[model samples]
Target: GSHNKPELLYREETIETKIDFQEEIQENPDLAEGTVRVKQEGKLGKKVEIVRIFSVNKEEVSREIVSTSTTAPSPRIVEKGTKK
Candidate 1:
């Protein structure tokens, strides 16, 4: 080991969250039996999680999730036929 070498510390953290979406289905008897179609496509919602990290010397010591945020999700519409 060299005395001239400077000690450096590094830390890394990770956070995860769920993105949600809505879905709806409609049924029609006039179209046909066992028929299904998509009226509107569903889109994914947005969300994120925050993380904090701490380190001592060159090794990581601890990590934790500090906060979370999300955006509202939109709904999807679907159509179905039940008539023969």
Candidate 2:
């Protein structure tokens, strides 16, 4: 493979506690989850995607336990827009 060839790679990831929800309040002490944020930097084309498996604070505890968090990753732009 040529170095000039584009390659797919994993990028940034973040995990936050889902301690602000109601169901969580009645469940475990505190629960947290994470997702994989990916970005491809290659000679061909640049693309970004976020992927993750949804999980509960305590999956084995309460099947109906609820939690809420901004697990969705934000959009990534190759270039920043200039303010006029």
Candidate 3:
């Protein structure tokens, strides 16, 4: 072992995850029965998670979350026809 070795080290890691979209169905009486059409498509949201890792002598000891962020999530719109 060397005397000039690092005893403690700190590092940061950035992680990202996708948020699931929601499904919304709308009923309409203008169209005939057994009709199904999708008006709009949904998009997944973005989320960022920042974590800090603590280690000693080039070995991992513990990790903790420091910051978190997220974006707006859109919903899926579906049109349904109901006519008698």
Q: Considering every candidate listed, which one attains the maximal TM-score?
A: 3
Residues 1-84 of candidate 1 have per-residue lDDT tens digits of: 333534554444445455667799999887687788888888777776777765555455667677777766667888899953
Put the candidates in lDDT order, highest first. 3, 1, 2
> What's the lDDT for all of these models?
0.69, 0.30, 0.86
Off by over 4 Å in 3: 1-4, 29-40, 80-84
Q: For candidate 2, what is the lDDT?
A: 0.30
TM-score of each: 0.48, 0.17, 0.64
The model with the greatest lDDT is 3
Global CA lDDT computed for model 3: 0.86
Candidate with better TM-score, 2 vs 3: 3
